[PDB]
Amino acid sequence: AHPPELKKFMDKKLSLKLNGGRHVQGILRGFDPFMNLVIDECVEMATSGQQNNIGMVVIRGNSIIMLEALERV
Amino acid sequence: TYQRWQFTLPMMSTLYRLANQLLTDLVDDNYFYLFDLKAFFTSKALNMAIPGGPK
Amino acid sequence: SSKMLQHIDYRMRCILQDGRIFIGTFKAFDKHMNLILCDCDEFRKAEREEKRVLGLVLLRGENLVSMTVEGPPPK
Amino acid sequence: MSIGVPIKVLHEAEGHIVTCETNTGEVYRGKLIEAEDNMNCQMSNITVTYRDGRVAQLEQVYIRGSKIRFLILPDMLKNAPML
Amino acid sequence: LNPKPFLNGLTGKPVMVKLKWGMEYKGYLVSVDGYMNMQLANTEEYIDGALSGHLGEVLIRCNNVLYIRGVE
Amino acid sequence: KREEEEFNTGPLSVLTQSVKNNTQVLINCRNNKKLLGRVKAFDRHCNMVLENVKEMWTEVPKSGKGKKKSKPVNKDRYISKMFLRGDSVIVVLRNP
Amino acid sequence: MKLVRFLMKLSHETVTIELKNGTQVHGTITGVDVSMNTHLKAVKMTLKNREPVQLETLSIRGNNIRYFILPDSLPLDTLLV
Amino acid sequence: TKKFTLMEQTLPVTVYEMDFLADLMDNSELIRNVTLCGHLHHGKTCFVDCLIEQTHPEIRKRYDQDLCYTDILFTEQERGVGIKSTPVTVVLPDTKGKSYLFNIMDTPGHVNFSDEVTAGLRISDGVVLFIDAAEGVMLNTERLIKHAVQERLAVTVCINKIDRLILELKLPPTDAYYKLRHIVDEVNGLISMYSTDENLILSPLLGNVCFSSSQYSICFTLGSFAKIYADTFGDINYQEFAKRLWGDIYFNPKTRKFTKKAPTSSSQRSFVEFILEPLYKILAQVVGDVDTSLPRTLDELGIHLTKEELKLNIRPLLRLVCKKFFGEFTGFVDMCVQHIPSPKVGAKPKIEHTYTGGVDSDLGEAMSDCDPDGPLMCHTTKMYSTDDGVQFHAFGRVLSGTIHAGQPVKVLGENYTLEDEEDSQICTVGRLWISVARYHIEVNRVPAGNWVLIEGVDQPIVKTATITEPRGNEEAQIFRPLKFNT
Amino acid sequence: PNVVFIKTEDPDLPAFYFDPLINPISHRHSVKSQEPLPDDDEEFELPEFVEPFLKDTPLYTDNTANGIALLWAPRPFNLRSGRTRRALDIPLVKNWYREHCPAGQPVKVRV
Amino acid sequence: MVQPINLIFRYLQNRSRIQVWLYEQVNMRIEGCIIGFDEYMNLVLDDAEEIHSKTKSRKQLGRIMLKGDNITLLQSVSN
Numbered sequence A: 001a002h003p004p005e006l007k008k009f010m011d012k013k014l015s016l017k018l019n020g021g022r023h024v025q026g027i028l029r030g031f032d033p034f035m036n037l038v039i040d041e042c043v044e045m046a047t048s049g050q051q052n053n054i055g056m057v058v059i060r061g062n063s064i065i066m067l068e069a070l071e072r073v
Numbered sequence B: 001t002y003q004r005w006q007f008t009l010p011m012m013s014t015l016y017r018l019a020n021q022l023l024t025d026l027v028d029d030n031y032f033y034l035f036d037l038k039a040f041f042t043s044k045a046l047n048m049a050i051p052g053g054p055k
Numbered sequence C: 001s002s003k004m005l006q007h008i009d010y011r012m013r014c015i016l017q018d019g020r021i022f023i024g025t026f027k028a029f030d031k032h033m034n035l036i037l038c039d040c041d042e043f044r045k046a047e048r049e050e051k052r053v054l055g056l057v058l059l060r061g062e063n064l065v066s067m068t069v070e071g072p073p074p075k
Numbered sequence D: 001m002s003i004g005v006p007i008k009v010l011h012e013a014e015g016h017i018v019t020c021e022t023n024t025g026e027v028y029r030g031k032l033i034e035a036e037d038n039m040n041c042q043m044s045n046i047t048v049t050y051r052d053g054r055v056a057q058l059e060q061v062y063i064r065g066s067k068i069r070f071l072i073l074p075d076m077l078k079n080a081p082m083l
Numbered sequence E: 001l002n003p004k005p006f007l008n009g010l011t012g013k014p015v016m017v018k019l020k021w022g023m024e025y026k027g028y029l030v031s032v033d034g035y036m037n038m039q040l041a042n043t044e045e046y047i048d049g050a051l052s053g054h055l056g057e058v059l060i061r062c063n064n065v066l067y068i069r070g071v072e
Numbered sequence F: 001k002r003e004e005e006e007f008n009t010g011p012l013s014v015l016t017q018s019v020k021n022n023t024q025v026l027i028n029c030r031n032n033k034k035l036l037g038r039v040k041a042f043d044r045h046c047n048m049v050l051e052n053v054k055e056m057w058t059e060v061p062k063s064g065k066g067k068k069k070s071k072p073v074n075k076d077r078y079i080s081k082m083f084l085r086g087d088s089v090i091v092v093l094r095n096p
Numbered sequence G: 001m002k003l004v005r006f007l008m009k010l011s012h013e014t015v016t017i018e019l020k021n022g023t024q025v026h027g028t029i030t031g032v033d034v035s036m037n038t039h040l041k042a043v044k045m046t047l048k049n050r051e052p053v054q055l056e057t058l059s060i061r062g063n064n065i066r067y068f069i070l071p072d073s074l075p076l077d078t079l080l081v
Numbered sequence H: 001t002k003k004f005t006l007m008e009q010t011l012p013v014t015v016y017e018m019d020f021l022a023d024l025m026d027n028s029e030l031i032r033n034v035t036l037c038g039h040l041h042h043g044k045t046c047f048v049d050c051l052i053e054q055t056h057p058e059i060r061k062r063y064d065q066d067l068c069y070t071d072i073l074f075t076e077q078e079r080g081v082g083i084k085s086t087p088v089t090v091v092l093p094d095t096k097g098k099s100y101l102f103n104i105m106d107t108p109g110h111v112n113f114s115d116e117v118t119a120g121l122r123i124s125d126g127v128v129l130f131i132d133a134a135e136g137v138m139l140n141t142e143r144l145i146k147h148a149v150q151e152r153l154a155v156t157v158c159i160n161k162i163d164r165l166i167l168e169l170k171l172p173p174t175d176a177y178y179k180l181r182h183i184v185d186e187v188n189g190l191i192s193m194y195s196t197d198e199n200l201i202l203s204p205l206l207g208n209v210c211f212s213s214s215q216y217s218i219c220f221t222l223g224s225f226a227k228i229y230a231d232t233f234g235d236i237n238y239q240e241f242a243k244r245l246w247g248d249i250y251f252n253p254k255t256r257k258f259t260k261k262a263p264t265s266s267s268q269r270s271f272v273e274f275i276l277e278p279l280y281k282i283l284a285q286v287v288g289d290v291d292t293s294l295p296r297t298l299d300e301l302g303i304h305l306t307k308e309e310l311k312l313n314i315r316p317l318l319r320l321v322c323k324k325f326f327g328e329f330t331g332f333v334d335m336c337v338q339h340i341p342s343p344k345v346g347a348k349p350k351i352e353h354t355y356t357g358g359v360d361s362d363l364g365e366a367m368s369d370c371d372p373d374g375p376l377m378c379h380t381t382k383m384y385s386t387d388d389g390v391q392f393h394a395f396g397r398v399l400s401g402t403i404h405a406g407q408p409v410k411v412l413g414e415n416y417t418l419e420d421e422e423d424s425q426i427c428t429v430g431r432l433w434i435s436v437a438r439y440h441i442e443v444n445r446v447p448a449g450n451w452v453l454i455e456g457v458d459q460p461i462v463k464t465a466t467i468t469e470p471r472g473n474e475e476a477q478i479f480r481p482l483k484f485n486t
Numbered sequence I: 001p002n003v004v005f006i007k008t009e010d011p012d013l014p015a016f017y018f019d020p021l022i023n024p025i026s027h028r029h030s031v032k033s034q035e036p037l038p039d040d041d042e043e044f045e046l047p048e049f050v051e052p053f054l055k056d057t058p059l060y061t062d063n064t065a066n067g068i069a070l071l072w073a074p075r076p077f078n079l080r081s082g083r084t085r086r087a088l089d090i091p092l093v094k095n096w097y098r099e100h101c102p103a104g105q106p107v108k109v110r111v
Numbered sequence J: 001m002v003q004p005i006n007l008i009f010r011y012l013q014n015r016s017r018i019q020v021w022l023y024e025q026v027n028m029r030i031e032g033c034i035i036g037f038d039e040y041m042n043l044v045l046d047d048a049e050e051i052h053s054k055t056k057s058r059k060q061l062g063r064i065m066l067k068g069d070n071i072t073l074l075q076s077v078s079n
């Protein structure tokens, strides 16, 4: 079927690497057929390593180019 | 030349029960356990008889 | 289809979107122009020039620009 | 439906060791686990080469389909009953 | 205000469309459609805010378009 | 048939009248260059079949690292008939 | 309408094409497909700045194309049907 | 001439390249080692035939007579009772098309021969259990469940001879459903009684039981049948469908969703309405109206037969019609692949049970990793005589390391210990073969995880023996001799 | 294995029916198990036109009851096609003497 | 499970002030209050202040519609 087999990764702690050289790290709970993610406890990794905290975020599917686990399935 | 025959199943299903007086209604070959052709051969290769078999 | 199918099992030269070149023996293609190249070389350009080797390369269709023949078949 | 020969060879590739290069220029080298019909791969136990030289090891990774621009499938597959 | 009613609203007003490549147009829009292509009338083109010229009766093609904003 | 209702009414009507009147129309490609044309047919993807065309741009390649910018005075080469893949389009004018 | 079908009737005439990445081919055409996939034979290349090349047959993916360059040897009027 | 066995001189045509098979053998996660066991004449051998017939295009059954492929002995064919555990190695595809290597140890089902099961059980990772649908559980079915579970293999069960319901007993669908469900429940009861684990409950929803008729080449899981369903109509998430096709789930045709409660008193179950009833309608047309309405029916199924095929007798014709409908036995693969662990994963329980030194030993750790480049540790459990009867070939599992042609190996007999080395001998390994029941493929080497026939090591071996490097693994020990069922 | 075929006596009955000779299935789930049946209305619905495969055609037809019975008929009657034999070769009475007839018959015939 | 088309609806009902990051153009962000989704994730942002971070200054726009393919994240911030 069309959904990504992302079911494994849920509630484990992800890093993402986003289009345009951006990085965010997250505990995950969402996916839909386009891979639109809903990330929780989401940190923004700025260029300089000055880190922000931000709340729950949606991501557009096409913006992702990798999706990595910081703590295992 | 009358070599080959090919019948539909309503034909066969009739012919079977016309013949029914001659045929025996054994559904499976378990009956002939020591009463088949192979068993008699053993009774002929040895010198020793099956009770109802030929001699 | 029928024009592409003529090429099969030959030794094909592909030019990718970024400017790279692959040269490979060609045995698959698909409605999105995916490819499987086989026994394959990665090749880049006195102006310096270089030749790297790759195996059984599976090319996602988006990258392809053009492909060309230069060999008789590896029979 | 006519999901043709290449994606079947991708499914055939699973459980081996494949190399996989993304638009940006990162080169991954990892053991495959599953691959989907749009080429979303999961990959395990990777040694990644960065665009500028550096190596790193990784636990597990999932690589969006349209973001790839070759895989290096393991050579023994040339015999496979897809071909 | 869902996006489909909204675009019917802005019909005939003044609107200012900004394209991904950093050009921008001022226009009195004339229609929109299923893919959100657009037409504009009596248009100006800004390039870093320079009034480049009165480009007559433009059409714009929908993949180019970032935000559209309405003008006081 | 149903596209005819769209192409008369909607934003594509710019192209539609451009065929009937045979006004020129100044297109702006993605490679910066402009195509000025008398569009002789089209489809919904903005594909076009152009004529009497003159493709005007400043030619300053990346090769120069400062040398090529010496050349701002432009060019105008005249392509007699020309089909154009639709996705090359960012905007289109009417000229009158 | 449906101009891609006009790009199949055009067979075995002669064309230049410029591709999107500044490539130019010069070719005689046989075969075209629903997704504009071009195949040319008797092919002369010229890359961006780099010098010409000449090739037997060249097959060009659909979405890399930009403008063709038809010959003046087309009477256009036939395309209406 | 002494040639009392039906060995084939020439290698038959296969769908797969033989080079591809050897390549797969290195990939220790792709291979599966099953054993098929279950009570007398429940249809094991004839099932295996249907795999071979699928895999070897030149080989076909005779219309009049079963092709007992693994019954290689005249003695065995004369009796009609399997007497020797005969291994078969084939690669056969999944529903996905992904090709896996199966080593299938076809075993006897007669109670006395049970020795043959236990030997093949030891080298296997998993049981497939065959039950005649008409008879259900019988004496030897219960014994083999008990034995397998004690040996810590994963178990999955296969319900054979479903055709007997339709044609012999003539049971209506709903009662036939109850006959199936009864079999499943009895097996669950037996397992849960013996096994201390509780997670191994088996039920069609979970994939690990499949329904088959081996005379007529029918095999389907719930997943497999839905794959047929989806490839017809399109746009079905077939894995989600297969969850809904068993037990007390009823279909509501007005809302077109499934519910646990029957919308009318005559609402047949999801299983009956979707699985059984179209199965029934296939068979009752073929054995019924072959003259009048069978061509019309075959149109709807998308099956086309030539005018020469349509003149076959009913038993050949029925097998043919189903073979086009179901196609490959992919359902059997899905059951085996998921539930039965690969040798990588399976190594840890296997070493723990069978090895007297246990997992705590350095060699125990090395064998658990199942490394092909590790220390050679091979276990032989069966002996098969040559075609002439002069020699015996040892058969075993390369439980670690790699065996090479011509290599000198130390063979450890069953009494060997670190305190008594007298039960050991050094032997020169001759030719190796991957074994297939009637023809043998010779190979240069066999990596860890696969089965192999070994020539010339048979002299010091009485029954079991451990094969190990003569100069490296000086602290190796034997595997425990087989604890027979009786 | 014991062929278990149940001879339908009269053609009025439906060809598939639980004939009284067959022992009734005692089983009815008493200790009712709660195996992983998905929850009701959990987002699964079929496309518009899927149906049970052969639903247009009846479960049984009048020939179905008769046609099954041929499958265990003796050797010339269980087949649709064969090859003709000579009138010499068919042994009409052969089936009788191959079975051990009931001993109450006179001595003379037994031998 | 938290589906994303559900989450964005919760941001409508709060009428929150959310900050969007554009595709490729890291140096610019939009910071909108929101009502809007046809299925493409096209947003309609009322405040819509542009944040050109080299200049730090904050240029102001009308009631703008932000076409779906330009989006990346969808962060939550204060008003």
Ligand SMILES: Nc1nc2c(ncn2[C@@H]2O[C@H](COP(=O)(O)OP(=O)(O)OP(=O)(O)O)[C@@H](O)[C@H]2O)c(=O)[nH]1
Pocket (backbone or CB within 6 Å): H039, H040, H041, H042, H043, H044, H045, H046, H047, H066, H068, H080, H081, H082, H083, H107, H108, H109, H110, H160, H161, H162, H163, H164, H212, H213, H214, H215, H216, I001
């Ligand atoms: N009705 C029916 N009979 C079958 C089917 N498959 C096999 N049989 C018959 O059942 C008998 C047993 O088949 P085998 O497979 O040789 O016996 P087995 O299961 O291997 O058991 P062993 O003899 O101990 O090796 C044979 O006469 C087959 O013709 C089936 O699918 N349906």
